Amino acid sequence: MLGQMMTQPLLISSLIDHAARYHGQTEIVSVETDGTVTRTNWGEIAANARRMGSALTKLGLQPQDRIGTLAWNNRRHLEIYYAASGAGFVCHTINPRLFPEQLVYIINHAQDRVLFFDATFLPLVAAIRDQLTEVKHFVLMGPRNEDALQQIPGLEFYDELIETGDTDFEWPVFDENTASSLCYTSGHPKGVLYSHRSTVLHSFASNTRDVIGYSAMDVVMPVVPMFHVNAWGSPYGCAMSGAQMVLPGPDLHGEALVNLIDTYGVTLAMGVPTIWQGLLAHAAKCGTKLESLERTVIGGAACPPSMIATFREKYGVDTVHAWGMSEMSPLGTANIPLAKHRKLPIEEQHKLRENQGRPPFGVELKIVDDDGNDLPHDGVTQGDLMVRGHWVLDSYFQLKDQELLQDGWFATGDVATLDPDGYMTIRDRSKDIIKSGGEWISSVELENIAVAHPKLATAAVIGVPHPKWDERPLLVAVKAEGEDPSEAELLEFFDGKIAKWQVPDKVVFVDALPLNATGKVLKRKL
Amino acid sequence: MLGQMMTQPLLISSLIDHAARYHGQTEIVSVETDGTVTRTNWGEIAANARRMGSALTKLGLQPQDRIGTLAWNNRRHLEIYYAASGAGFVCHTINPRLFPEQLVYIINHAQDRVLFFDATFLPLVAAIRDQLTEVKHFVLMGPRNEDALQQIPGLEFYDELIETGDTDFEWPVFDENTASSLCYTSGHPKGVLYSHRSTVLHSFASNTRDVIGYSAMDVVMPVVPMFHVNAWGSPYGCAMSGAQMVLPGPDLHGEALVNLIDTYGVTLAMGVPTIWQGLLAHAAKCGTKLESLERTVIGGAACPPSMIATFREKYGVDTVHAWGMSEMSPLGTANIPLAKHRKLPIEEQHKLRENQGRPPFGVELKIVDDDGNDLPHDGVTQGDLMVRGHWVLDSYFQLKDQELLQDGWFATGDVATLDPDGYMTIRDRSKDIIKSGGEWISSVELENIAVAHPKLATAAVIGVPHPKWDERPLLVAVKAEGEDPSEAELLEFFDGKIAKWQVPDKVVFVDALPLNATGKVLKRKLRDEFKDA
Numbered sequence A: 001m002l003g004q005m006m007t008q009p010l011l012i013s014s015l016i017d018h019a020a021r022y023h024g025q026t027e028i029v030s031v032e033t034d035g036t037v038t039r040t041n042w043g044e045i046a047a048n049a050r051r052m053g054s055a056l057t058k059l060g061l062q063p064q065d066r067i068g069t070l071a072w073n074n075r076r077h078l079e080i081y082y083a084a085s086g087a088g089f090v091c092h093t094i095n096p097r098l099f100p101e102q103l104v105y106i107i108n109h110a111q112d113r114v115l116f117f118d119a120t121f122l123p124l125v126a127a128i129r130d131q132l133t134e135v136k137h138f139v140l141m142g143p144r145n146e147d148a149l150q151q152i153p154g155l156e157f158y159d160e161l162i163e164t165g166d167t168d169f170e171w172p173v174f175d176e177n178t179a180s181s182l183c184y185t186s187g188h189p190k191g192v193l194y195s196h197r198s199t200v201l202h203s204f205a206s207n208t209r210d211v212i213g214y215s216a217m218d219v220v221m222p223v224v225p226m227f228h229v230n231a232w233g234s235p236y237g238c239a240m241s242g243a244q245m246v247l248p249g250p251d252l253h254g255e256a257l258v259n260l261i262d263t264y265g266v267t268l269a270m271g272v273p274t275i276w277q278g279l280l281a282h283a284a285k286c287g288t289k290l291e292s293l294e295r296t297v298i299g300g301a302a303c304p305p306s307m308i309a310t311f312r313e314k315y316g317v318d319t320v321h322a323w324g325m326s327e328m329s330p331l332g333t334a335n336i337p338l339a340k341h342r343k344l345p346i347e348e349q350h351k352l353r354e355n356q357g358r359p360p361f362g363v364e365l366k367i368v369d370d371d372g373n374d375l376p377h378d379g380v381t382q383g384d385l386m387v388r389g390h391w392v393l394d395s396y397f398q399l400k401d402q403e404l405l406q407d408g409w410f411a412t413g414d415v416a417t418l419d420p421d422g423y424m425t426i427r428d429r430s431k432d433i434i435k436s437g438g439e440w441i442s443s444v445e446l447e448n449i450a451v452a453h454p455k456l457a458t459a460a461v462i463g464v465p466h467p468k469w470d471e472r473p474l475l476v477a478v479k480a481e482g483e484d485p486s487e488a489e490l491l492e493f494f495d496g497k498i499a500k501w502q503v504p505d506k507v508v509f510v511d512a513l514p515l516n517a518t519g520k521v522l523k524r525k526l
Numbered sequence B: 001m002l003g004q005m006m007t008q009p010l011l012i013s014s015l016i017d018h019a020a021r022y023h024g025q026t027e028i029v030s031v032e033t034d035g036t037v038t039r040t041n042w043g044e045i046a047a048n049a050r051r052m053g054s055a056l057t058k059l060g061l062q063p064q065d066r067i068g069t070l071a072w073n074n075r076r077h078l079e080i081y082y083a084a085s086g087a088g089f090v091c092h093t094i095n096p097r098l099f100p101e102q103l104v105y106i107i108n109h110a111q112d113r114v115l116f117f118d119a120t121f122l123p124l125v126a127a128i129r130d131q132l133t134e135v136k137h138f139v140l141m142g143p144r145n146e147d148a149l150q151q152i153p154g155l156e157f158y159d160e161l162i163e164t165g166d167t168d169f170e171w172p173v174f175d176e177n178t179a180s181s182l183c184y185t186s187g188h189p190k191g192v193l194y195s196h197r198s199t200v201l202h203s204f205a206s207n208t209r210d211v212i213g214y215s216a217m218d219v220v221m222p223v224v225p226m227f228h229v230n231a232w233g234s235p236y237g238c239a240m241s242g243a244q245m246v247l248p249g250p251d252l253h254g255e256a257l258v259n260l261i262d263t264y265g266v267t268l269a270m271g272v273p274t275i276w277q278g279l280l281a282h283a284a285k286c287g288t289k290l291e292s293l294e295r296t297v298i299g300g301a302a303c304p305p306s307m308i309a310t311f312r313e314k315y316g317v318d319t320v321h322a323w324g325m326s327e328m329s330p331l332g333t334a335n336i337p338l339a340k341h342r343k344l345p346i347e348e349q350h351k352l353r354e355n356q357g358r359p360p361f362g363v364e365l366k367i368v369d370d371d372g373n374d375l376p377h378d379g380v381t382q383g384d385l386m387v388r389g390h391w392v393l394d395s396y397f398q399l400k401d402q403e404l405l406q407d408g409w410f411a412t413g414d415v416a417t418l419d420p421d422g423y424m425t426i427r428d429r430s431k432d433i434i435k436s437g438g439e440w441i442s443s444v445e446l447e448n449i450a451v452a453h454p455k456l457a458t459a460a461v462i463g464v465p466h467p468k469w470d471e472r473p474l475l476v477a478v479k480a481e482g483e484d485p486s487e488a489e490l491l492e493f494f495d496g497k498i499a500k501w502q503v504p505d506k507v508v509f510v511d512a513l514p515l516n517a518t519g520k521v522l523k524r525k526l527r528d529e530f531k532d533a
């Protein structure tokens, strides 16, 4: 027997409609590439998104065609998010800091039919343009620019394309499991293809109070890029709650960020540690209080504890350490305390804020041993982190037969501990660990010693099996030009640079490593 | 082309599993019927829920059979919530304050096969038992009690039935649009048949900051009964967040509630206005500061503005005024500020927290006129309030094809304004609005002015017939403790706050307002009692 409630698909276009309906005047600030600052609002972004969704449809694109972006956090990128997905296309956010050969691969593999880009990346797009066979419209995210048209003959312009859209466009209605957007990971990059369902449930979860939780009273500054992992979902979550937004565009250095916070009264800022280090450096120099800032979200790389202490003690700002990855849309955990934590001594309360955090409803975590078996969640045993839930991927884009999931779970590639309350601690990368009995050994830490040897051009380190220690490191070295180092002096080089028991057991000389389409397939091991 | 994400049904059983995995030691306090206090936790509620779900599966029940409850807010009720819905049955909470004859109607119309009930209602179930012929299991929520076995032959006992369930029961996996739970709302009462998907989506919305947002650090005390729209969703939202809970049991008078707040450190409490009058009344007498209380959710009836002021001014407690209905499972609107409001003068800011609030993502509101056409959302025009969304009902139980919706909207029966910011103001239920002269009078606006008088503890305004004006407002007032206002000064208190012709013509004094089964003023019996003068 089914329930008797209204049923409605969980569509991304319903988020922007809600912001337009009940928060249409709520202010959104957009730092443009030409130095301009746009003052717009959710209502205007919704109208532009609808009109651009019509304009995209009138190009004759097919349902779920990919729409690529190479763009900063700005109002036109926010509009494309809703325009592409809302109209039933796939919003494909591309990282413009990648190497050109990586962009060529991603754009062609995704088969973006449209490529929106910001003016910053005009030389970059012009350079790879002739390798981008499948792209039918190149669109600068601004108005007609004659120098731009010189670099890319045939270029189109956002501010002209949008005027071709019908002003009374109606979002189509489709199955909520329809593909919505696309983000590639760091061999080649692999694309994770989100649905409207997974996006919307992820925003729901992120909008809860113990995860991030956007309020309409917030001024939210996503410094995390919209070009990677959806800016942690904040373009979706801030629409759900009608939060104010400050989109910082290309100027992400410390002085510009501190000025955005103080000029617009940012209450919630989201970034990664390197960007925050620039912000904290400037703030300490100019003596600002960051008066309006209440809390920050830091994810993407391990949040340093002394950064948490700085925000807390200099500024009275709480730091949410959050963890995730492209494959989880991105949010996996967030470090918020539990009730029982108020009764610990204040200093123990501070160290509890340091790990990657606890998972919200909708995501489940476990750690497994090297044969796939569950390990206790005692906070001390280390295992391969496995995840599943409503916004974890099932398979990579154009790669379904590769049996990604293991017993319905996704292997993150991280080694972690998990305590009984699900607080997770990244410890290592599964692919980097050689499981020498007793203490494990990092392969890259051994490589970085080895490649620094002046008589070695390069070298690789692999775990190779051993009858007593299970897995032991082997050094695969290629001698520097005109040099002939002995095995003994290469291993002697490790003396004092690392514990003796981690030194590779044997040296093997190759004249070259066997390359994949760029890196080294050390699965040989043969 | 579909996405390539894991897809899993939105099941109520994943809420309790999540709480057991990651909040398994988070504490839940349960005031029991006998007079005892159980200290348990989500891990324990979940293990008992899993095992009760096994035991109910072994009774032979068929998928989505109704499991009825007549119960207070306590650990066993919470366990049944998850045991029943998790096992694929329909958790049917029944209000034990209805007349026994209404209960017979409801239980037969819903065809409950199992009837869990607290010891408080042993007499009442024994009296109406012979008219509940489709109930196969009467389960006292407690251990074997031979006196109980006396009043009800064949009576089974919760603490015996649960031990029949496997300790390793795996929840079944079924369509998220499967019926999960049923609540009757008031001709005859009608059933609202919720689904697992609607339930989980409503829990997601209630857990946002600007609605309620239960935190793992909250101590949550729902005084709202788990038989009134599932205690406003809180057994689901709290499980989703792993909040601590205080389940108050049978004693909901002010002194009992004050003691629970101070004894267990309640941070967030939720209830209809009348339960907050007793609490605030007693708190003023004993002098408590309600130290742990941070927040309150007050809805079901209009929160008096002076009640909001008291919590804010006297306790530093912020009151979230919220509106909803059984048909919206229940959340419709919640009153939280917008950023713009922080610039306004401080008392325009207090003023904006008085209305019923603004809708969250998942809910849509509009008002329509008597012909059904849209009305401006200008904050002043009045119309019939209409709703649609992910947790709004499509049709009533056993009444699937009866043209309930108007162009896909559900008609709430409330008269309201809606402002351009989406804030909703209840003018009145359609049934209580007063038609005096040629214009409508909001009884709700009138009573809340009267309640604010410092010499009244509470008050109600009702329309009574008048030979010239059709009907006229009557002030039914309750004198505050230590106060003795005259009729005239209560009437003069209205001057300037409302049009002259809207001031009630007369005051009558009563010791208490008659309350219905959800603690709302029974204005119908007030209109009967005072049909003269």
Ligand SMILES: Nc1ncnc2c1ncn2[C@@H]1O[C@H](COP(=O)(O)OP(=O)(O)O)[C@@H](O)[C@H]1O
Binding pocket: B184, B185, B186, B298, B299, B300, B301, B302, B303, B321, B322, B323, B324, B325, B326, B327, B356, B412, B413, B414, B426, B429, B518, B520
């Ligand atoms: N904050 C509120 N202010 C005024 N009325 C309210 C409020 N919240 C709920 N209600 C009223 O209660 C109604 C919903 O429930 P009701 O009709 O009393 O039966 P039930 O609560 O069992 O659904 C609403 O339609 C509205 O009339």
